[PDB]
Amino acid sequence: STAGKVIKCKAAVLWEEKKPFSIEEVEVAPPKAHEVRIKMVATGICRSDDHVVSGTLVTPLPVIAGHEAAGIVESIGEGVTTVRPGDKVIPLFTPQCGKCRVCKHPEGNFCLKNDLSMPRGTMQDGTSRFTCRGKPIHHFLGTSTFSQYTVVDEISVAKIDAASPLEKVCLIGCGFSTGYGSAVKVAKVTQGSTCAVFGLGGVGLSVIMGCKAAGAARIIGVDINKDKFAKAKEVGATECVNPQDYKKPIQEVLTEMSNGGVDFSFEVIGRLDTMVTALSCCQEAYGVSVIVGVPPDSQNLSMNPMLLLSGRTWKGAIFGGFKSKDSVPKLVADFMAKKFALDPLITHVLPFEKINEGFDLLRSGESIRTILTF
């Protein structure tokens, strides 16, 4: 009943940095060629969405944020072949065009069509599908999931199992897959190894899940909020440390705890200082450190390259290294077969209309993931 028509619906519009979202009516254009219009069902609150508010992650404003979500296709534009109306789908904030040198590379996943490295806040054609108060509104990462309806490019959506619980599998659209893949795919954690995970939010808990799935013998969680430790131990941390409890810098603490440095470390916060600390705490000759956290816009870290010359490996990744469109449906299938759990990440559920309360819960330290239902 809405195919080819503008849809008026509610969205959470961010007009200004460091302000609440405005829940108000927007106009969502119908999908053009190779575009998909999605009726959203559930969306998680990821710290990266908060980074848009705080100006940590710069993207043009005004904007509809949201990138961790699941929904049902309402309509498809001309030439779409990979989804149909009524399909369950997860928007892909990292696209998979299938044609660029990264998509063709066996390891690569950061498709050259992404809108993360130099955000423009548009569709692939450089235009917007959203109007609010007669004004064009930017997209976010090609997804814009804080809306009852969004429009995405076909390379930014994956069809998932029709029997999927969308209020759970939305987490496969960012925080679970990122953390789990950072451990299993990017770091390639080994059986019997010692891991250190800096930051015990939804992504860091997913890193722990991946380290435990890979057979790590020790998984040391690191957080300044000791309220995060109980859940970290539930999902596989063998011990947790709060840097504020120690006189010495935590890289020295972790090096001593691991009898000379850890095998694998993960920065899952977004601070320059913890990226350098996480590198330093991995064993100097064979350690691996993975940056997962999003750094503050345009800021450089300072480090001594002797940390690398001795033999350390330092890498980072988007979306856990997963090729998004190939991997998301498989992750959903594995979830349905109980190969991993998502409930440990979900601490709060709210209606979409209470999105600002969901951000309050994240900012207070209380929540891991709040799932918003449309």
Question: Which residues bind to ligand NAJ, rule: CB under 6 A?
Answer: 46-48, 51, 174-175, 178, 198-204, 222-225, 228, 243, 268-271, 274, 292-294, 309, 318-319, 365
Q: Are strands 130-132 and 369-373 parallel, antiparallel or unpaired?
A: unpaired
Q: What is the DSSP letter of 290?
A: E
Pick the closer one to Zn ion by CB: 7 or 65. 65
Pick the closer one to Zn ion by CB: 97 or 211. 97
Pick the closer one to a second copy by CB: 129 or 312. 312
228 is in an annotated binding site: yes
How far apart are CB 247 and ligand NAJ at their closest, in Å? 16
Interface residue with Zn ion among 97, 208, 290, 317 (CB under 5 A) is 97
Which one of ligand NAJ, Zn ion, a second copy, none interacts with residue 306, CB within 5 to 8 A by kind? a second copy
184 token code pair: 């299993």
Interacting residues with Zn ion between 158 and 187 (CB under 5 A) = 174
Which one of Zn ion, a second copy, ligand NAJ, none interacts with residue 259, CB within 5 to 8 A by kind? a second copy
Cα pseudo-dihedral 202, 42, 140, 79, rounded to 10: 130
Which position has the token pair 């927007």? 26
CB closest to ligand NAJ, residue no:
201
Neighbours of 84 (CB within 10 A): 13
Q: List the x/- string, 75-104, binding to a second copy by CB under 8 A.
A: --------------------------xx--
d(CA 147, CA 139): 11
Asked if 121 contacts 127 with a C-beta cutoff of 8 angstroms, the reply is: no
d(CA 249, CA 83): 51
46 is in an annotated binding site: yes
For 248: left if phi > 0, alpha if psi spans -120 to 50, otherwise beta; the answer is beta
Strand partners, 218: 194
97 is in an annotated binding site: yes
Classified as helix, coil or strand, 139 is coil
Which one of ligand NAJ, Zn ion, a second copy, none interacts with residue 64, CB within 5 to 8 A by kind? none
Neighbours of 370 (CB within 10 A): 23
Which position has the token pair 């750094």? 295
In terms of Cα–Cα distance, which of 51, 86, 78 is closest to 67?
Answer: 51
48 is in an annotated binding site: yes
Interface residue with a second copy among 9, 272, 336, 341 (CB under 8 A) is 272
301 binds a second copy (CB under 8 A): yes
How far apart are CB 93 and Zn ion at their closest, in Å? 7
How far apart are CB 281 and a second copy at their closest, in Å? 15
Binding site residues, as ranges? 46, 48, 67, 97, 100, 103, 111, 174, 199-204, 223, 228, 292-294, 319, 369
Binding site residues for NAD(+), as ranges? 48, 199-204, 223, 228, 292-294, 319, 369
